[PDB]
Assembly symmetry: C2
Homo-oligomer: 349 residues x 2
Amino acid sequence: VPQELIEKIKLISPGTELRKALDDIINANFGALIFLVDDPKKYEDVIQGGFWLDTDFSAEKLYELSKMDGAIVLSEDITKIYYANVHLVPDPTIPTGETGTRHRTAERLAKQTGKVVIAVSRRRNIISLYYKNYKYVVNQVDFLISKVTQAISTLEKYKDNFNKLLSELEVLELENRVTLADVVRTLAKGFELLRIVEEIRPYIVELGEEGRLARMQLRELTEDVDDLLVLLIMDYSSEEVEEETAQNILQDFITRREPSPISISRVLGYDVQQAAQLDDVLVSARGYRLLKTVARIPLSIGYNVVRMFKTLDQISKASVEDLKKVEGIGEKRARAISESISSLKHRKT
Amino acid sequence: VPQELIEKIKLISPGTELRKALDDIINANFGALIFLVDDPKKYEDVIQGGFWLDTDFSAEKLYELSKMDGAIVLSEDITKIYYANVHLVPDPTIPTGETGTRHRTAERLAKQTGKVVIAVSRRRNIISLYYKNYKYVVNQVDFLISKVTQAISTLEKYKDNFNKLLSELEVLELENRVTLADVVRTLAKGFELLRIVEEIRPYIVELGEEGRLARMQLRELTEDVDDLLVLLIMDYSSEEVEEETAQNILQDFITRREPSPISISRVLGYDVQQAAQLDDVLVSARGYRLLKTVARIPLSIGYNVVRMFKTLDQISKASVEDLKKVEGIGEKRARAISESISSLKHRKT
């Protein structure tokens, strides 16, 4: 969905004065055909009859004017109402995939002029926006809320399982009994969870001001999910991998590529063929996740710790004295790493 | 009905584009409140909100504009539409006998500004015009034509009985056997007939262009009735009377006085009490009716003929030579008088 169009959609999103007017128009079952231009004098050829108003915009004014037949012409920034009750006459030879007279007119005018044309039928209750060669159907708030409420409820489900898999992996990680299947199963759930967020994003945008609460909910549910997945990738990829590269792996499975067991393992650097092989492949976390999220060690210093101890298993056996031998680790950080890991081991295993 | 108001009523009479728009508005059940002003500027205090149009007037424009709430402001010459969708705010303390905001507003504004204000409500099919302290309800053409067609039928019946009375009176006059009762009876019918015309007149005017046929019919039915009645007055009044006076008698009995037998015989100069006496008073026509209508002698000259011979009885005995002794009576007039009267006697008596 082109960005140029996304901006135009904002013009009619819940919260704007124009959308308030369109909502009342729909409710009154009046139709509507709105043409948005900047310089009215240049379109006199496609604008016939009607009344020249050239007055300041207002939701009530638009609504009242919509009682008359014909189209309304507004300024692109929605600050002025130039015409009302006019006949829009774009070239009738321009191809169109619409059925209604006003929608055929709308599409053709949008294509012919490259400007925004809004069409609202008397019968249905959807706002059809046309811009250049694009067409975007804007849905009613109640329809959007219903879809978004279901999606969020679906996300809670996915998140719940994600948390379960993660607490399981934690135990195994602390006991150094992880297999590639444990890692993949965890990453897959997290990938699917974030895809849900991606697919739902357009409805959220479409909700405008009516999507505040929905945004807050998605935020609480997915807060540190992405960082956590990037860290698992850094901890279990077959070869040392940078953060930026891990952030790119995440991005790939959240959109482009499908998160299947064999595929994730493959991308992680494991020449695997059968999904069943995963349970046989043993792996040990590098230690980044625990160091950053629990010990609060910046990845930069993290790399140093890993470079010396190799795995979380070794790191967990090191002493403060040992940990201090690492660059970037003073008495404070060594004590944090050591104590936080020891604390987790005693409580989780 | 002040002529001043009549001029305003023409603005919304059948035929005008304004009435054309008002009828369409009535059929659509939209409402209408129209304010006619010369210069909008000096009325901005009573004009709130709405839209400034300052465009050329047309019935289609008025009809479309009326789909919105509020009032429309036009130029007094109905050539310009200045405002649409405005709130008219006359002084609320101005007295009004109207019901419902639309008509109360119209009456008060008309009273306040001395200008014309037209109101059309949804729950009825009539136009109310307010001018100063006047109110004129304009009826639909169908209603008007119904009343006018009945009035014409009623007129045909009166005319027929009038023709029968005048016909019998003619026999009596030629035989010099007329009684006051025959004259009054004929006058009364004539007076009553012209009274109907006066009463239906305001309906014909209200019909505008659609009252053309009605006017033509009234003209064919009452053609020479007024002239005929005047001549009857000049011929049977107790003592000589000039035409102009006969006319005052006519006008008087058409509007002021009631055409009762006794009342007519009294104004004619006869002192009677009971209608029973009329059959006993013998009278003789002076001959004006016959002289002017049949012999085609100008009244101015008939005066001389009557002043010399006195009655139709004497004129009918006169010879061509005897008649020429009259000032203004030549060979032609003399022959015309003598021959037309002799012809009538041979045919009607």
